[PDB]
């Protein structure tokens, strides 16, 4: 996260770390949506131009974390993966359309002060909250500055950012945008800054509903060009748009 701050402890108890077993590496972020299910970006698991194709046995998830590198005894939980599910129409060849994957844990994880699932939006919530200028929150242990710009946070980072209207997102980049994405971040003339970055992918863009006081995951960190550049905006996977796929997978493969 660029130009964010340190999270408060327990501020984002649905934050998940995807961790490569061997060699040991933080791959990306993820989110906990029930005791057996973690949501992430598909490009974190499958991205063949960079020879990335992780299987279940290649990865672990670390839940309830704050520190990026410490082992948080009696606070974090390590889970193995039963199965990875990638959107069948994830387009890694062009624009990361439908950049979304689910991972089923081997065993259910017990909830705690530090570990607790985020809500997924229903139609009314998405419609009420998905408006230009409305802000969500993005969390992650990704780069603190643009890649090559040279770096890593000590603890989980948090930034709040406004949703940007489609024409502004579309005109910001030559990458082809779809309705399964949205963008967020400040315009140059708004002065304030902040963006997600490399290594933040798969982490949640969340909004707090004033109707019921609950946090909802509206977005998945997906892509961008550099980080925190004037006139660029971070792009997120539009979760409510893909909710019918999410439900389908959980209904078929859940317990």
């Amino acid at each position: 996260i660029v130009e964010g701050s340190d999270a408060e402890i327990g501020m984002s108890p649905w934050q998940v770390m995807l961790f490569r077993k061997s060699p040991q590496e933080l791959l990306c972020g993820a989110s906990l949506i029930s005791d057996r299910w973690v949501l992430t970006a598909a490009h974190c698991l499958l991205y063949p131009p960079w020879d990335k194709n992780f299987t279940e046995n290649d990865l672990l998830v670390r839940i309830g974390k704050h520190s990026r590198t410490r082992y948080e005894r009696n606070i974090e939980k390590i889970s193995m993966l039963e199965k990875i599910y990638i959107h069948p129409r994830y387009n890694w060849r062009e624009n990361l359309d439908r950049d979304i994957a689910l991972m089923k844990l081997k065993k259910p994880v017990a909830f705690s002060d530090y570990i607790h699932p985020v809500c997924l939006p229903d139609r009314e919530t998405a419609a009420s909250l998905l408006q230009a200028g409305y802000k969500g929150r993005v969390t992650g242990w990704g780069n603190l500055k643009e890649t090559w710009t040279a770096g890593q946070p000590s603890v989980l980072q948090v930034v709040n950012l406004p949703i940007v209207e489609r024409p502004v997102c579309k005109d910001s980049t030559r990458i082809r945008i779809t309705d399964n994405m949205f963008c967020a971040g400040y315009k140059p003339d708004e002065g304030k800054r902040g963006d997600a970055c490399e290594g933040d992918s798969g982490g949640p863009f969340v909004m707090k509903s004033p109707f019921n006081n609950r946090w909802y995951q509206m977005g998945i960190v997906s892509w961008g060009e550099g980080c925190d550049r004037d006139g660029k905006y971070g792009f997120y996977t539009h979760v409510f748009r893909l909710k019918k796929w999410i439900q389908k997978v959980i209904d078929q493969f859940g317990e």
């Binding site: 590198t69 082992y71 005894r73 390590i78």
Partner: peptide, 7 residues
């Protein structure tokens, strides 16, 4: 950097 190991 370096990750601390479990336990």
């Amino acid at each position: 950097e370096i990750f601390e190991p479990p336990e």
